[PDB]
């Protein structure tokens, strides 16, 4: 059984394929061929948040459009307010190596991480008017590339151990313990249900995971480097990926194969961050040539360009709403577009 | 503006000013990155080191500077993903031990890569060869052939010594970046002054740059 | 969280004095202040403010010119001078703090004062002053003047209650929004220059009395107050 087993899953790999290859009748591309361009997209800066003495490596959008958050090299987290460009609080941070920070839904919590290998939370509205550190979580033997709000009390991380877990705030234990992956773990996103969720890793696949029973139900493959971005379509079923090869793809959940790939002959640096719009019609990406683009979801074809950094672009953010979208680049400075 | 408004507008400038205070006092460091094989004296470097697993930092002063220093040992994973961090350092310490046969030709490959990465193009190295009296005591039963197949030579101490600094100096590839070299023990106390006498000759080379001279 | 109000004696008119009140419990120094005083047989009333810093100072008309305010941040203590004292001093002060920002609610905790002897402006109205009412809707009204909805889209309406020998509490903040550690019995709604406070479901330790205030702009004004008897 020593080399036997090994035939038994060639065999599967195979049949596995040719099921695909037999649901594939007619691509995306044809059937949208009769549809109106969207034509072309013209944003110009609104605001200029300055504060920030180091680089910017993430940002995450409150649930009200009018608060957000940002993580810093030089120990500090940040709470803006877009409207007046004002600051609410400043949060010192023990270890100045973050890489991740999220706003909780309810909006009473943050959460930060990094090369410590420690997940804190930080408790925003309490008495004696300052913002303390509830709980840290630890247990991870890598560094911590994502994290995630489920509700108040469960936080769902990714690490560099190819080890993705389900936390208990409360309890500060880990609860469910995803495995499955080879390389290192980059992305996370969450379902519109809050029932399931994807993640990217480095080498180079994607994964389906279900909450409640802790289980892998599809795995897609179709890069050739690590993926950086992942996101999900607004309806729920489809999402998109981001790798260093210069190419953005788009997976079908219930088709199970891919659908559409963004690329041009122009474009060589890797991406670092994508993120959908209200529709799902406009696709945005940052990539490492200073600038972020936007794609036509539907017919591949590039739409317009945002140009305003010297630096490479980290993190992208849409609000709730749908009116303004935030890109935070390693020039110390995040602008908001419209 | 309302008058909770006009509140508001003053509490965001005090939080300005602190923000302004710290920058100041953090721009007064010197960053420093170790590197080195496991049980290569990293941990034992500086003898007035004090600490203030994932990554682990130490810090010391010396006539009137502060050193930082950083030890990246406990990531176990992709170097590449997070080696980007580290680039506004001022200098690299890398530790090589003379008397581990079986860790050579293993930290030849990792300087290898530090000395030839996309973020390192321009970084001065500072080399530490350890234990020179237990190399020097071993080398008379193994005569060196053991880790270079070929090497020819009386090596008592001088040539062998020789042979492996020139092997490490080899992998350099920048015209902008320089190598410092030294031979310490485990009784050697004057540490601290060979890192001060690097790090200000590195100063001074980037200000030639600048002038246009060099 | 505490504050503890010192001071207060028979002051003969003419004299000077001085209040301290000590704060143990809270950061300090990331807090506005405010004094309120209130006549033997009377309502509230707004004295001075100082803001986070020492860098804001507000007066009332009554007594600019002969009261100072300071404050201590390392010892976290909270002054109080007064010179020229009249016959029209006597009340008891209090201390309030408030903090400013996007989503605060200022004047959340008071303290107890101490008792003090010697021997353009917005009007806002309440009409109703002894209303006699268990388990039962209980309606009151304030006035303004001008309007209290600015631009922004906010409407700077306050609601306290005082319980008998106790210190106000707050209860609702900007006319919609509901204070912590408060029921869910407690509503309130209106528009500009009406405002309306309603409570369901009435039950014990709900008498007293309740005032509506403003903070649009300095100075601020408190009403009458509404009673609430059995």
């Known amino acids: 059984e020593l080399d036997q087993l090994r035939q038994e899953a060639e065999q599967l790999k195979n049949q596995i394929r040719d099921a695909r290859k037999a649901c594939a009748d007619a691509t995306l591309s044809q059937i949208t061929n009769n549809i109106d361009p969207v034509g072309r997209i013209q944003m110009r800066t609104r605001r200029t948040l300055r504060g920030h003495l180091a680089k910017i490596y993430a940002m995450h959008w409150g649930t009200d459009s009018r608060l957000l958050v940002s993580a810093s090299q030089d120990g500090k987290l940040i709470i803006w307010d877009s409207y007046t460009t004002n600051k609410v609080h400043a949060i010192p941070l023990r270890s100045s190596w973050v890489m991740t920070c999220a706003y909780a839904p309810s909006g009473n919590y943050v959460a930060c991480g990094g090369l410590d290998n420690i997940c804190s939370i930080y408790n925003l509205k309490t008495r004696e008017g300052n913002v303390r550190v509830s709980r840290e979580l630890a247990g991870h033997t890598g560094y911590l590339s994502c994290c995630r709000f489920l509700d108040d009390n469960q936080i769902v991380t990714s690490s560099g151990d190819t080890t993705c877990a389900l936390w208990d705030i409360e309890t500060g234990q880990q609860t469910t313990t995803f495995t499955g992956h080879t390389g290192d773990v980059m992305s996370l996103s969450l379902a519109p249900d809050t029932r399931l969720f994807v993640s990217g890793a480095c080498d180079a696949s994607a994964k389906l995971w279900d909450v409640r029973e802790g289980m892998c139900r599809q795995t897609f493959t179709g890069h050739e480097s690590d993926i950086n971005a992942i996101c999900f379509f607004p309806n729920g079923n489809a999402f998109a990926t981001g790798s260093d090869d210069a190419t953005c793809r788009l997976f079908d959940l219930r088709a199970d194969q891919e659908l559409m790939t963004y690329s041009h002959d122009n474009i060589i640096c890797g991406i670092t961050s994508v993120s959908f719009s209200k529709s799902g019609r406009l696709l945005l990406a940052g990539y490492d040539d200073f600038n972020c683009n936007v794609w036509d979801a539907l017919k591949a074809d590039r739409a317009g360009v945002l140009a305003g950094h010297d630096n490479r672009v980290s993190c992208l953010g849409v609000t709730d709403d749908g009116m303004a979208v935030a890109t935070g680049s390693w020039d110390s400075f995040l602008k908001i577009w419209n | 503006l309302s008058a909770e408004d006009k509140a508001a507008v003053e509490r965001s400038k005090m939080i300005e000013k602190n923000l302004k205070e710290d920058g100041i006092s953090a721009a007064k460091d010197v960053k420093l990155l170790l590197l080195g094989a496991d049980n290569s004296g990293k941990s034992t470097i500086v003898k007035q080191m004090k600490i203030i697993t994932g990554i682990v930092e130490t810090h010391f002063t010396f006539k009137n500077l502060h050193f930082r220093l950083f030890d990246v040992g406990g990531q176990r994973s992709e170097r590449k993903k997070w080696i980007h961090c580290f680039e506004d350092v001022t200098a690299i310490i890398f530790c090589v031990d003379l008397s581990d046969y079986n860790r050579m030709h293993e930290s030849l490959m990792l300087f290898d890569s530090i000395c030839n990465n996309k973020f390192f193009i321009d970084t001065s190295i500072i080399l530490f060869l350890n234990k020179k009296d237990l190399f020097g005591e071993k080398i008379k039963k193994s005569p060196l052939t053991i880790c270079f197949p070929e090497y020819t030579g009386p090596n008592t101490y001088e040539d062998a010594a020789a042979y492996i600094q020139a092997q490490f100096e080899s992998k350099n590839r920048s015209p902008n970046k320089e190598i410092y070299c030294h031979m310490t023990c485990a009784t050697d106390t004057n540490n601290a002054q060979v890192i001060f006498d690097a790090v200000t000759d590195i100063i001074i080379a980037n200000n030639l740059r600048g002038c246009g001279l060099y | 969280v505490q504050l503890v109000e010192s001071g207060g004696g028979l002051v003969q008119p003419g004299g000077s004095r001085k209040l301290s009140c000590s704060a143990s419990?809270?950061?300090?120094?990331?807090?506005?202040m405010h004094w309120v005083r209130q006549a033997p047989e009377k309502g509230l009333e707004w004295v001075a403010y100082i803001s986070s810093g020492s860098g804001t100072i507000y007066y009332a008309d009554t007594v600019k010119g002969r009261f100072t305010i300071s404050r201590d941040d390392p010892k976290n203590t909270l002054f109080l001078q007064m010179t020229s004292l009249r016959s029209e001093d006597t009340a008891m002060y209090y201390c309030v703090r408030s903090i400013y920002y996007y989503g605060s609610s200022p004047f959340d905790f008071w303290g107890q004062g101490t008792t003090l002897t010697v021997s353009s402006d917005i009007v806002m109205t309440q009409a109703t002053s002894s209303v006699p009412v268990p388990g039962e809707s209980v309606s009151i009204s304030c006035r303004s003047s001008?309007?209290?909805?600015?631009?922004?889209?906010?409407?700077?309406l306050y609601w306290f209650l005082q319980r008998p020998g106790q210190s106000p509490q707050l209860l609702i903040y900007?006319?919609?929004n509901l204070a912590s550690g408060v029921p869910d019995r407690f509503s309130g709604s209106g528009s500009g220059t009406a405002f309306t406070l309603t409570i369901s479901r009435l039950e014990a330790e709900d008498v007293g009395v309740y005032y509506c205030?403003?903070?649009?702009?300095?100075?601020?004004?408190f009403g009458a107050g509404t009673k609430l008897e059995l």
């Open positions: 900007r006319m919609s």
């Open positions: 419990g809270f950061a300090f120094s990331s807090f506005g």
């Open positions: 205030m403003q903070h649009l702009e300095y100075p601020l004004t």
């Open positions: 001008k309007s209290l909805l600015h631009s922004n889209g906010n409407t700077y």
